[PDB]
Amino acid sequence: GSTRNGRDSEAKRLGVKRFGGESVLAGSIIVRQRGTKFHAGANVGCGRDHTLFAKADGKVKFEVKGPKNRKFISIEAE
Amino acid sequence: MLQPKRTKFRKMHKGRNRGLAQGTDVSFGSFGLKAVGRGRLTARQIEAARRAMTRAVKRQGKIWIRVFPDKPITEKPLAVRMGKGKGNVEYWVALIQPGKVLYEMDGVPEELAREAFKLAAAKLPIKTTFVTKTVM
Amino acid sequence: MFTINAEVRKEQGKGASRRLRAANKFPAIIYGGKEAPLAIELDHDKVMNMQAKAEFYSEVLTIVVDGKEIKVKAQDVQRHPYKPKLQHIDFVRA
RNA sequence: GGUUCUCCCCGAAAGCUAUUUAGGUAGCGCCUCGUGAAUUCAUCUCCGGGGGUAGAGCACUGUUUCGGCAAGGGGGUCACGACUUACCAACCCGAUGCAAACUGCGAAUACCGGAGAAUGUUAUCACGGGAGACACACGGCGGGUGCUAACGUCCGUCGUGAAGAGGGAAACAACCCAGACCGCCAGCUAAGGUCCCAAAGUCAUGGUUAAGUGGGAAACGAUGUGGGAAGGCCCAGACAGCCAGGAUGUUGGCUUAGAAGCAGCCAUCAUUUAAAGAAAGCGUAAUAGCUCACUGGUCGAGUCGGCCUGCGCGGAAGA
RNA sequence: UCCUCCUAAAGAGUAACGGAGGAGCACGAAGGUUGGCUAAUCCUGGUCGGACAUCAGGAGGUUAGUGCAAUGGCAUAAGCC
RNA sequence: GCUCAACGGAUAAAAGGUACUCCGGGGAUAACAGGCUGAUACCGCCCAAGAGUUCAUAUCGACGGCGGUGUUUGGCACCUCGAUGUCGGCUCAUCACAUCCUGGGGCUGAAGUAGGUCCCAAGGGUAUGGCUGUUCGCCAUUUAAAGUGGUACGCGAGCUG
RNA sequence: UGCCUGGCGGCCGUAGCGCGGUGGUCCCACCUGACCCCAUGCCGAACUCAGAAGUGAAACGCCGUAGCGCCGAUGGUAGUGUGGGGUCUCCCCAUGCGAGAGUAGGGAACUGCCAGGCAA
């Protein structure tokens, strides 16, 4: 007979690129993600694609803050 | 034939039948029909093993059916080559793990329930046993 | 009047519990109050005949271990999935 | 299709993207040679990490079983109004399961970064010269599909073959052990074996099997047999036989034809008594009647019925 | 040809004539800034007005919305004025 | 300024037949047959609602399940395209038993003859004809019987077409 | 130094709901009047102004209560890395990791800076 599926897309290569304590030079993408699964914290910016880019050549560190426990991404400064 | 009503998707994957069961304790009735072998029960096999069991416990009493299939099985027609899409849904199986209680029964003596679960066990492809509701 | 002789476990885990289960025995534990939970090692063939009575799951048990006597009750029991045998019993020290 | 002398060292791939492209070709991943570089890289220990898979669960989306309250609905019944209500039944409540396109939870592995000892002919990266290859196959694991069929097909990782000789599984690339520089009528060993063919235990101890099981096959059936935990009845006398009773008003009701010990509703009483159920079956158009249960004598020591297990039997018929 | 989920085996990637759906647009406001606000679905009362229009109150909590099929995300709101 | 949608676009511009065919290759890829499996087919088994005057098991056995064989229809494409001749017929046959008859038995809803089912047993035998190219199938007449399958759906370096 | 209260944080349900009680000389809220500063796609309900008569009613803070929510052992089970095995659509052995659910139980938050009131 016939089929109606067989269609997908170029896998977007998302996820975290730089993990925990791992020195990142300013402007380095850390998390490439759909929505704000991981939120931007200290010294880390958020782009127009919810890519949290580093902003200060330092470390990383994820956390949980407020009263929603949203992994948060900060940048220890070394 | 126990058939679901408006499932989310028409066809699903094959899937493995690994692991243990969850419905081990006899909860609703006093005497249960617990499975020992690892297999699966099509939708015709529950209804066929119910007719040969309910008639032996003549209609006064109450019988609980602890399993429901909710899993479609495809089947390619004859003289059809491989591929060219997924087959059409024909019947519905219930994945049975070892330890799953199949039927339960209350309102009958222990002798009547013993000689009636054996009549339903001969309709099933899996090896079953006779269990009793224990305290706690 | 229910007396169950038991011992103290020296190895614990999954591999220690399956060696102990193939020798007609099964582990248990006594806990409650403010004392430490004692790992309980006892025989299966006696206790399987004890739980056939309806007073085994309601009255006060007397488990004898290390020469002592501890008055316990029955809280949680794990049946085997397809065999008439036991795996573990929780005893409340009361 | 063929491609002609010898030796040494290293040594692949059958993958991705593109392609009027699928059996061809380019780049990259893989190979070789040279050059230049950082305790470069790997293994291990510790630390910092992100999950959301296996598992588990029903807080969310769905599916489904039972019980209670229960709107609504339903069949029927009355005189613009409504009385009876064998029935189906929404949301919560208690319990129970299922899901790749469900996750209030959540591993082991795997991956990234940092510190440290040891080891490995720098095994790591970049550039330059030269390629080959882009038909893969099998086995384990996680799978889609097919019939949880195929030496079937499509994926991810590892191993093997390809491109690896040797030993073993009788023969048998892909299964197991193990990587052939050469020579020796030297020893040790892994997988597998030690009655002979065919090299090595007719080796020691304790059990099981009667089937040629071992040396194909399930549902299911059966006083085969061994071991274990318990129970009923019992030398104030058990279990299977032998000898006596094994009945009485019940033609009881039932649509009023008969079901009458043994047809359907049924209660499933109660006396005569050492013992008899208004019957489990054997006979009947219903009865008659053969019969054990339940009771005594005889006899005399154990018997009977279930459970988990190890080896067994049948089911088991091809040229 | 492109986009979303699963298969996809908890970094990324990953095939099949595998299972489900969409796109080849639109907007000068539906963009930017500032200020303010929190719904869906039920229950009760009330003129036409009824299962559902508008008004008042209660529970409920984002089950609503996000221009468009799906995933992730959104109360500091990206939702509404 | 291109639904250059065959969307990394070969030209601005392009449909069909070959049984009159032809060349270079492939079992990288089908048709006959072999091989693996057994969805399907045939046969056997398990429970027992019921039909059978009462009576499941003389006999048939629903709803379901479990197996065997490789005889049908199917799946894959592992050998074969530097050739494996193939439907039916004639001659010649060989093997298995899931036995058509002959032989020995059990049960019977077996009075006898005549039956029905099942077990053992393959020693021997197992139609002539009208139709169709037919294997099958229909019909006439026999016979104790006119068996079921395997062997490249046996057999074309044996014949035919 | 204590008890309170107000503003700003960490932590985010052991911290959040329900019931009962309590607080006004301080503070806070309700409230008072609005012609004016401002403003309602109508209304000063909200926002904003000028004041303090009354109350702690609603809101908010504090205490008790487990009636829910929530945290959470120890043991056991599922799962799984590596090496083997089997009656191999699944399971076991040796070793390492170790859930989820559930049970005993804990549990009516802790605390930093500054200002004001009160007792010292």
Number of H helices, E strands in chain B: 2, 7
Q: Which nucleotide is nearest to B9 (CA to C1')?
A: E20
DSSP H stretches of helix in B3-135:
43-54, 110-121
Q: What angle do CA C43, C44, C46 make, to 5 degrees?
A: 80
Q: Which residues of C touch B102 (CB under 8 A)?
A: none
Give residue for tokens 């007979």: A1
The structure was resolved experimentally with cryo-EM
Preferred mutation among C56, C61, C75, C82 to probe B, highest tally of B CBs within 10 A: C82
Residues forming beta bridges with residue C55, ordered by sequence position: none
Sign of CA dihedral B54, B59, B64, B67: positive
d(CA A54, CA A36): 15
Q: Which nucleotide is nearest to B125 (CA to C1')?
A: F65
3-state percent helix, strand, coil for chain B, nearest multiple of 5: 20, 25, 55
Q: Which residues of A touch B85 (CB under 8 A)?
A: 1-3
From B129, which residue of chain C is nearest by alpha-carbon distance? Answer: C82
Strand G nucleotides, any atom under 7 Å to a protein CB: 10-13, 73-80, 89-98, 102-104
Q: Given in angstroms, what resolution was this structure solved at?
A: 3.2
CATH number for position C30: 2.40.240.10
C58, exposed or middle or buried, with CB in 10 Å at 0-12, 13-18, 19+?
Answer: exposed
Task: Calculate how close chain C gets to B130, using CA atoms only, in Å.
Answer: 10
Q: Which residues of B make CB contacts under 8 Å with C?
A: 20-21, 24-25, 34-36, 98-99, 129, 134-136
d(CA C66, CA A70): 52
Sign of CA dihedral B126, B127, B131, C1: negative
Which string of DSSP letters, residue by residue, matches C4-71? EEEEE-S--SSHHHHHHHTTTEEEEEEE-TTSPPEEEEEEHHHHHHHTTSGGGTTS-EEEEETTEEEE
If we measure between CA atoms, which residue out of B103, B107, B79, B113 comes closest to residue B26?
B103
d(CA C76, CA C66): 23
Specify the number of domains making up chain C: 1
Query: By residue range, what is the domain housing residue C89?
Result: 1-94
Give the neighbours of chain A: at least 3 Cβ pairs within 8 Å: B
Give the neighbours of chain B: at least 3 Cβ pairs within 8 Å: A, C
B19 touches B96 (CB < 8 A): no
Strand E nucleotides, any atom under 7 Å to a protein CB: 2-8, 11-22, 71-76, 78
Does the structural domain B21-136 have CATH classification 3.40.50.720? no
